[PDB]
């Protein structure tokens, strides 16, 4: 008989919260929340992915579960220093999310022939799995 009180556990807007930008010339790019302007606006910076330091509406951005050490109001060079240091890029690269983004991005670049090759493969993979799914 402990107490057991759920949680509900949200990603936060906080300095050094990495965000995936979704509208604009950046878009698909990551970046870091530096300072914090109002309930609806934050200052972001993403030197590594090439996104300009800027003000941005939180609604244009989506919060990732990644965070890393960042002095609030840190300038661009400082951001790029800590970013690297904190290895955020491999960390994100590694996530189901980015993996899913990379996936469909590939599917979209296939070639009519590549597409055809995929089919032949699936027929093959199906043949052996259907067997497996029948023996135990």
């Amino acid at each position: 008989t402990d107490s057991i009180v759920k949680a509900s556990n949200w990603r936060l807007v906080e300095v050094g919260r990495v965000v995936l930008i979704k509208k604009g010339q950046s878009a698909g790019k990551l970046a870091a929340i530096v300072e914090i302007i109002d309930q609806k606006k934050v200052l972001i910076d993403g030197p590594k992915a090439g996104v300009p330091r800027q003000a941005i509406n939180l609604g244009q951005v989506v919060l990732t579960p990644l965070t890393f050490a960042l002095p609030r109001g840190a300038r661009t060079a400082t951001v790029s220093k800590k970013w690297a240091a904190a290895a955020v890029c491999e960390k994100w690269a590694a996530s189901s999310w980015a993996k899913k983004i990379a996936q469909r991005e590939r599917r979209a670049a296939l070639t009519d022939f590549e597409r055809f090759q995929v089919m032949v493969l699936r027929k093959q993979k199906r043949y052996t799995v259907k067997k497996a799914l029948a023996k135990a």
């Binding site: 008989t1 402990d2 107490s3 057991i4 009180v5 759920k6 949680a7 509900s8 309930q39």
Partner: protein, 191 residues
């Protein structure tokens, strides 16, 4: 102006373990258990440690914040109800006709039966609510005594009795007759 975070505390006593999923609160103590639905609210409960829970409202207006505190209390009073318990006291009031109060039962019922109110031939009846129990307090003239694990159920069952004894068609400040809630308290004493 939308307050970015305000929160409250709910203290937890030695014998009880509150537990909350979605927004459904179950509080279980020495005196039994109480459960109450909070889904109509939007606060976020958080256990910090078996003697402490925090409730909070992110980015809220006045009405929203305003309902933070009343959440705190409603779960507070579940916790106290389940430890000390509640006990509402009522006395009869009548300037000539003795109000006679009994407890009848039909079909497992338990009803509070009020007779001779202001003389009335009419027989008054109020249901006994489940969870609340009723003793006609000995050693006190015309005292009825409702008690239970649930404030809201004893407070209401009392108010049910007092109100079934409204006086019509008379100057009700001269005809003060009725059963009135005369003391609000706890069951377990010294406290």
């Amino acid at each position: 102006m939308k307050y970015i975070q305000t929160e409250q505390q709910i203290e937890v006593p030695e014998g009880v373990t509150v537990s909350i999923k979605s927004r459904i609160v179950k509080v279980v103590g020495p005196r039994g258990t109480l459960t109450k639905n909070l889904k109509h609210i939007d606060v976020t409960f958080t256990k910090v440690n078996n003697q402490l829970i925090k409730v909070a409202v992110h980015n809220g207006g006045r009405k929203h914040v305003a309902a933070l505190r009343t959440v705190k209390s409603l779960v507070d009073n579940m916790i106290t109800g389940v430890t000390k318990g509640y006990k509402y006291k009522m006395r009869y009031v009548y300037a000539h006709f003795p109000i006679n109060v009994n407890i009848v039962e039909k079909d497992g019922a338990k009803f509070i039966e009020v007779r001779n109110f202001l003389g009335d031939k009419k027989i008054r009846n109020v249901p006994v609510r489940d969870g609340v129990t009723i003793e006609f307090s000995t050693n006190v003239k015309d005292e009825i005594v409702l008690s239970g694990n649930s404030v809201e159920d004893v407070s209401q069952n009392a108010a049910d009795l007092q109100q079934i004894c409204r006086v019509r068609n008379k100057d009700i400040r001269k005809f003060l007759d009725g059963i009135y809630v005369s003391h609000k308290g706890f069951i377990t004493e010294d406290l």
